[PDB]
């Protein structure tokens with residue numbers, strides 16, 4: 001049996017147990033600011049990621065076991081002009097050596113808009129900009145090896161309000177669930193789908209966040225993570 | 239600071255840390271069978287409840303603090319005829335000395351269909367029968383001091399399939415959230431609302447489940463709870 | 477699998493999730509005052525206990541499993557005259573319906589000084605008075621069904637200083653361990669012994685504290701518990 | 715507030731969330747074999763370490779807070795000839811970029827036998843060989859920036875028997891406590907000392923194990939870690 005757990009109710013200025021990639025910084029309020037802000041305004045063409053430093057053991061070939069996990073986090077997206085929001089934020093799992101990929105609508109996750117099993121990426125996206133591969137309207141998606149989500153639901157942005165997300169994986173049913181609640185408006189969203197982590201991901205992964213602002217100067221928004229908890233448990237075989 | 243936590247991944251016979259009320263028994267598979275089964279068939283006019291034995295400290299007048307909690311559970315409803323499903327299951331919080339009330343559509347929670355502040359009940363119902371006070375169709379509801387829910391959403395019962403429920407209370411925003419997922423069909427539901435526990439409930443409560451079958455012989459279903467976790471935390475004052 | 481867990485970093489004035497027996501009260505500083513204090517002075521012939529309200533599932537005959545547990549607590553004993561300290565404090569496990577027994581050197585645990593398998597008591601005692609059955613000097617003891625400890629070690633009371641205790645049970649080796657640290661003086665103690673909980677105790681028990689002041693007017697001391705954490709885990713069968 | 719937690723009840727063959735240094739391997743039984751075994755026999759001049767991959771946040775200069783931690787582990791030392799046992803095993807905290815130092819009696823921890831504040835090492839040693847700087851006999855020691863322990867106690871190696879260790883740090887009293895139990899014989903040991911982590915260590919450290927066999931061919935023993943749990947909590951300021 002193996003377990004891994006961590007809690008941040010805020011982030012400290014030089015978080016050595018996070019691997020910060022691209023533009024990410026920690027703000028003086030203790031938030032993970034994934035995309036750049038200059039003089040109070042979000043900057044275009046920005047991409048940042050943040051991963052927990054330790055690999056997570058999500059399945060074991062030696063014992064044929066697969067882990068459960070539950071992660072919770074709070075985030076804020078603030079678009080000065082809601083009609084020109086872009087591009088969004090994702091929680092993801094990836095190989096341990098993962099590096100940022102293309103900005104904009106590919107969210108730092110993928111090098112192109114195609115499906116590739118060797119990406120070894122599972123993500124939950126909060127997608128604020130309609131690309132050519134996207135459904136109509138802002139949406140939450142489950143992504144497996146592609147920016148073209150396996151499943152999406154409609155999601156209405158409450159601009160500059162705190163969103164509370166919970167993502168869980170139940171190995172026994174191969175089910176990934178993602179929910180988002182805005183306590184400020186009493187609105188909530190949820191979806192789930194079958195995702196077989198043992199078939200998709202390597203035995204060890206890194207987990208974390210990515211976000212990107214739009215690739216034109218007027219399509220900007222912030223992507224800040226305020227708090228994050230993660231728990232995983234890899235059971236003994238039966 | 240106080241915390242309380244428990245996990246049941248299955249239930250034992252004569253569970254001395256549960257207060258079983260009405261018809262509830264534990265099955266040989268280790269499930270909490272809230273309503274009666276005779277020769278493999280659900281019995282009508284059955285009502286059963288199950289509460290954790292220890293009171294939970296949900297707020298403290300001495301320090302003016304209010305607890306957070308998160309509970310998860312799995313349940314199954316099996317109706318021989320899905321169109322004549324009745325009456326449903328609820329998770330609830332109530333005064334420590336709570337006793338079962340009326341069966342059928344009142345779900346063992348209430349003595350009548352009226353609102354009364356002295357009930358001191360907060361419940362999340364999974365309501366399988368349209369009573370005269372109900373919205374159209376099967377629904378999930380947040381109930382405060384009445385069987386007439388404060389808020390409902392539509393929910394389609396997946397007959398004899400496992401439902402995974404998560405109910406959480408965030409004291410800082412006075413927000414109660416309930417979600418339900420069916421991993422078998424990849425279907426999911428969520429709602430939330432403002433419920434001020436400090437104004438509604440006593441400082442200590444008991445928490446648990448109630449369920450009732452229909453009050454006519456053809457409106458029957460089982461209500462089984464398979465697993466249950468609960469965690470609460472009452473913080474120090476600021 | 478079943479788990480039970482709780483934390484008190486201090487105690488609130490009417491703790492409804494504790495079963496208080498005999499003289500126990502909660503002080504305005506939020507301590508569990510097990511033996512009586514009148515006008516700042518400890519009272520003789522006082523006995524008090526405090527149990528967690530929910531029974532703990534320590535073994536299961538259905539699945540042939542036995543629980544691990546770990547408990548930590550902080551306590552203070554203040555004897556106005558250290559040479560006339562009596563009688564001490566214990567942590568214990570007992571049947572669910574346990575009631576206080578004889579005061580003084582029997583510590584509220586036992587009706588007499590004999591061994592009896594039907595007592596179903598396991599205790600760790602902090603014994604400040606030499607009875608006829610006691611080793612020389614103040615001592616920590618592991619007690620099983622008798623006030624005559626199975627094993628003792630010497631322990632010097634540091635008067636009115638906080639003691640930090642950890643008691644743990646490892647089912648796989650049938651080993652109970654108890655340690656005490658005084659951080660103020662950098663002094664520590666530890667012992668362990670074989671106790672087979674499945675053979676000694678019922679499937680469910682209550683857990684908590686007991687303490688008694690001396691049975692003569694000049695042999696008095698306080699017995700206060702400042703904080704308490706408990707965790708138990710009853711595993712699935714192999 | 716930040717917390718970090720992990721559990722290994724056994725180790726899997728390529729543990730990517732551990733940083734293995736020197737000779738360490740994982741055995742087919744799932745043990746961390748810190749020093750080399752060849753044809754069933756321990757090899758001399760062997761040094762191995764194993765660190766958890768993620769840095770641990772032990773204090774924060776921004777908020778002036780200091781973390782608590784508790785770690786537990788099980789280990790076995792098997793010396794073919796008990797009279798020629800060498801050199802031992804330690805649990806330690808060190809800078810994030812820590813690398814193995816000198817083998818033998820310096821335990822991979824130190825470059826020499828001198829005290830140096832820039833080492834930034836806190837360790838608990840299980841020392842099986844009397845060096846020139848050591849007390850007489852096998853001992854447990856608390857070491858701060860030197861192989862010359864601040865405090866030692868006598869400890870008798872129970873050859874090839876499982877030892878259960880618990881090491882804890884209480885920030886409010888600056889107290890480090892270490893205990894060892896052999897459940898097979900019901901023998902136990904404990905010591906504690908004041909160690910100010912904020913003054914000794916950097917804000918982030920890595921934690922883990924080191925062990926070394928003797929520097930002559932006949933002074934050999936195994937050093938195997940069977941299981942490890944770690945929990946740390948960095949509180950919010952007052």
Ligand SMILES: *[C@@H]1O[C@H](CO)[C@@H](O[C@@H]2O[C@H](CO)[C@@H](O[C@@H]3O[C@H](CO)[C@@H](O)[C@H](O)[C@@H]3O)[C@H](O)[C@H]2NC(C)=O)[C@H](O[C@@H]2O[C@@H](C)[C@@H](O)[C@@H](O)[C@@H]2O)[C@H]1NC(C)=O
Pocket residue numbers: 116117118119
């Ligand atoms: C599907 O995704 C896989 C896995 O990422 C892609 O294969 C990998 O592509 C990398 C380039 O993005 C290769 O690494 C590079 O190797 C060169 C030469 O040694 C280095 O100079 C450079 O810095 C990189 O490290 C990597 O070797 C390769 N992995 C495997 C297992 O083959 C794959 O990319 C496509 O196919 C491979 C074979 C190459 O032809 C790539 O250039 C090409 O993009 C992805 N497939 C698609 C359609 O995107």
Ligand SMILES: CC(=O)N[C@H]1[C@H](Oc2ccc([N+](=O)[O-])cc2)O[C@H](CO)[C@@H](O[C@@H]2O[C@H](CO)[C@H](O)[C@H](O)[C@H]2NC(C)=O)[C@@H]1O
Pocket residue numbers: 086087103104105106129131213214215216219
């Ligand atoms: C039209 C324009 O002004 N800028 C657009 C730019 O078009 C040009 C202009 C000049 C040259 N060139 O050869 O120098 C090449 C391309 O090409 C980008 C690729 O489609 C547009 O990127 C999109 O920007 C959107 C916000 O406007 C979102 O960020 C959206 O996700 C993003 N699309 C992707 C796939 O990332 C970008 O807006």
Ligand SMILES: CC(=O)N[C@H]1[C@H](Oc2ccc([N+](=O)[O-])cc2)O[C@H](CO)[C@@H](O[C@@H]2O[C@H](CO)[C@H](O)[C@H](O)[C@H]2NC(C)=O)[C@@H]1O
Pocket residue numbers: 324325341342343344367369451452453454457
């Ligand atoms: C008509 C009949 O056969 N049975 C009906 C029953 O009738 C009688 C007839 C005589 C006597 N008596 O005291 O003599 C008592 C009751 O009165 C019940 C109370 O109104 C009907 O209860 C409803 O039954 C439904 C399923 O049919 C649902 O369970 C529904 O929630 C439930 N309603 C409530 C409010 O709980 C029940 O259907």
Ligand SMILES: CC(=O)N[C@H]1[C@H](Oc2ccc([N+](=O)[O-])cc2)O[C@H](CO)[C@@H](O[C@@H]2O[C@H](CO)[C@H](O)[C@H](O)[C@H]2NC(C)=O)[C@@H]1O
Pocket residue numbers: 562563579580581582605607689690691692695
């Ligand atoms: C010596 C004395 O004054 N009183 C003693 C009293 O014996 C008597 C009996 C009758 C009368 N009488 O009024 O006829 C007067 C005195 O009998 C008790 C034995 O049953 C003594 O109890 C012991 O007191 C000690 C502190 O003094 C410790 O608490 C010690 O644990 C306790 N012993 C036990 C077993 O609990 C108690 O002190």
Ligand SMILES: CC(=O)N[C@H]1[C@H](Oc2ccc([N+](=O)[O-])cc2)O[C@H](CO)[C@@H](O[C@@H]2O[C@H](CO)[C@H](O)[C@H](O)[C@H]2NC(C)=O)[C@@H]1O
Pocket residue numbers: 800801817818819820843845927928929930933
């Ligand atoms: C073969 C032999 O005698 N090797 C001995 C070795 O000798 C030499 C010979 C030449 C040179 N040189 O600088 O060239 C250096 C060392 O000197 C080592 C430093 O004193 C002995 O190390 C000690 O060995 C002991 C077991 O015998 C323990 O492992 C003990 O902890 C260990 N001592 C230390 C401080 O690590 C080691 O036994």
Ligand SMILES: *[C@@H]1O[C@H](CO)[C@@H](O)[C@H](O[C@@H]2O[C@@H](C)[C@@H](O)[C@@H](O)[C@@H]2O)[C@H]1NC(C)=O
Pocket residue numbers: 592593594595
């Ligand atoms: C063990 O405890 C009980 C009290 O809890 C005593 O009553 C027992 O006495 C024995 O059993 C009782 C019922 C009675 O038959 C008596 O004659 C027995 O001695 C006691 N057992 C012993 C051996 O002391």
Ligand SMILES: *[C@@H]1O[C@H](CO)[C@@H](O)[C@H](O)[C@H]1NC(C)=O
Pocket residue numbers: 354355356357
């Ligand atoms: C409901 O309110 C009425 C007074 O209007 C009261 O008589 C009754 O006791 C209340 N219900 C309870 C306590 O369940």
Ligand SMILES: *[C@@H]1O[C@H](CO)[C@@H](O)[C@H](O)[C@H]1NC(C)=O
Pocket residue numbers: 830831832833
């Ligand atoms: C103290 O330690 C540092 C690094 O561990 C080292 O570079 C330095 O030489 C040491 N100082 C001495 C030996 O005086």
Ligand SMILES: [Ca+2]
Pocket residue numbers: 087105127128129130131134
């Ligand atoms: Ca998009």
Ligand SMILES: [Ca+2]
Pocket residue numbers: 325343365366367368369372
């Ligand atoms: Ca209804």
Ligand SMILES: [Ca+2]
Pocket residue numbers: 563581603604605606607610
């Ligand atoms: Ca005594």
Ligand SMILES: [Ca+2]
Pocket residue numbers: 801819841842843844845848
């Ligand atoms: Ca040595």
Ligand SMILES: [Mn+2]
Pocket residue numbers: 125127134135139141147149
């Ligand atoms: Mn999308």
Ligand SMILES: [Mn+2]
Pocket residue numbers: 363365372373377379385387
């Ligand atoms: Mn309803």
Ligand SMILES: [Mn+2]
Pocket residue numbers: 601603610611615617623625
């Ligand atoms: Mn004694």
Ligand SMILES: [Mn+2]
Pocket residue numbers: 839841848849853855861863
């Ligand atoms: Mn030493």
